[PDB]
Design a protein around this ligand. Structure first.
Ligand SMILES: NC(=O)C1=CN([C@@H]2O[C@H](COP(=O)(O)OP(=O)(O)OC[C@H]3O[C@@H](n4cnc5c(N)ncnc54)[C@H](OP(=O)(O)O)[C@@H]3O)[C@@H](O)[C@H]2O)C=CC1
Length: 346
């Protein structure tokens, strides 16, 4: 395993991290524990969870992911070597059911969320606690460009940062991060930390893959100058970059076959781009999943790649991507496809 030191922190993260959002839905608790054991045996220390997992989310299963991870933590011990990252939900969205009434990123909601997460995770602190998505409407979750809003948000970034600061002082969270944010939002949080002597966010967890490189327009430069580094998610486009859905295929047991609500990587242009990337991989003798992962790993703004797997063989293949280094010729072909299909799946 390779590791990466996050600026302004004591976190040295494994270059690959283990995402967990299927734990409790597609994956059982024994599957979860087998993946956590395997990941740690391969040197991964970063485990990413959320109060809303697993997905697709519903009240009946809400919190099962954290509970499975906590049950594992209780048994395997060596807690201190792990970097357990969780999240507090933004305002309810996408017609999904909330966890709390009139859910917002204010002190009351954050206090409740954090305590419930710590209880399920069976630990007294989180290494990283992340704002899952912004309070204000912005360009995340399928929206490439920003649309002007009329309504000022109900809770400001300073409100949210001040609330988090209390729990950092209390030692319940070591570091704070954001998720599904933008260049404006990151810079505002950083401005506020300096102006008000408040904690400085250290990471942003945003989608990044061959199908959504939009982080490069505004956020990559923030990462270089400010040190807020990317924890990249959905680096296989929900599994589409493996090529498993090409030519109308709907493999049994796969995410998009089971849950047709997941459309983020199913648009017309996206499907054309997937076929093009898989073609590059096949011509260069690469596994499409590994090529997609190695492309994300090599970016200088990526601190860690959050892997997703529903089987042990998938997880083994994905961790083995560490050893793939992309050639100049493959990189140039990728650039050519990206010119034709630019940010197709925001
Ligand atoms: N902050 C946020 O808003 C978000 C955070 N995340 C984080 O990122 C993690 C990863 O996200 P996710 O969307 O799962 O990541 P990917 O885009 O990498 O999709 C992973 C899925 O693809 C399939 N797959 C994985 N590897 C292979 C392989 N080698 N061959 C064939 N199929 C494969 C599996 O699904 P299947 O077997 O069903 O086909 C797996 O669940 C999450 O667990 C979560 O921690 C994710 C989304 C949003």
């Amino acid at each position: 395993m390779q590791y990466h030191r996050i600026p302004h922190s004591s976190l040295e993260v494994s270059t690959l991290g283990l995402g967990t959002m299927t734990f409790g839905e597609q994956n059982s608790e024994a599957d979860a524990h087998a993946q956590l054991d395997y990941a740690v045996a391969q040197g991964i220390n970063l485990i990413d969870v959320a109060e809303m997992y697993p997905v697709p989310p519903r009240p009946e299963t809400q919190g099962l992911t954290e509970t499975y991870v906590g049950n594992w933590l209780a048994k395997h011990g060596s807690r201190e070597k792990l970097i357990i990252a969780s999240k507090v939900s933004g305002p309810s969205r996408n017609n999904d059911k909330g966890i709390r009434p009139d859910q917002a990123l204010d002190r009351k909601n954050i206090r409740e969320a954090l305590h419930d997460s710590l209880k399920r995770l069976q630990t007294d602190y989180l290494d990283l606690y992340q704002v899952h998505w912004p309070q204000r409407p912005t360009n995340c979750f399928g929206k490439l460009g920003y649309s002007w809003t009329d309504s000022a948000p109900a809770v400001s970034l300073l409100d949210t940062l001040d609330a988090l600061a209390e729990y950092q002082r209390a030692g319940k969270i070591r570091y704070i991060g954001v998720s599904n944010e933008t260049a404006f939002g990151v810079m505002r949080y950083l401005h506020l930390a300096d102006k008000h002597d408040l904690p400085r966010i250290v990471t942003i967890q945003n989608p990044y893959s061959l199908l959504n490189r939009s982080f490069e327009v505004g956020l990559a430069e923030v990462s270089q100058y400010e040190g807020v580094e990317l924890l990249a998610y959905s680096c296989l486009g929900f599994g589409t970059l493996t090529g498993k859905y090409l030519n109308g295929a709907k493999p049994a047991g796969a995410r998009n076959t089971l849950f047709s609500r997941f459309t983020r990587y199913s648009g017309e242009q996206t499907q054309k781009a997937v076929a093009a990337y898989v073609d590059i991989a096949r011509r260069h003798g690469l596994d499409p999943a590994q090529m997609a992962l190695a492309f994300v790993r090599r970016q200088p703004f990526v601190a860690s790649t959050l892997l997703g797997a529903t089987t042990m063989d998938q997880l083994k293949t994905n961790i083995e991507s560490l050893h793939l280094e992309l050639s100049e010729d493959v990189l140039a072909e990728i650039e050519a496809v990206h010119q034709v299909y630019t940010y197709p799946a925001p």
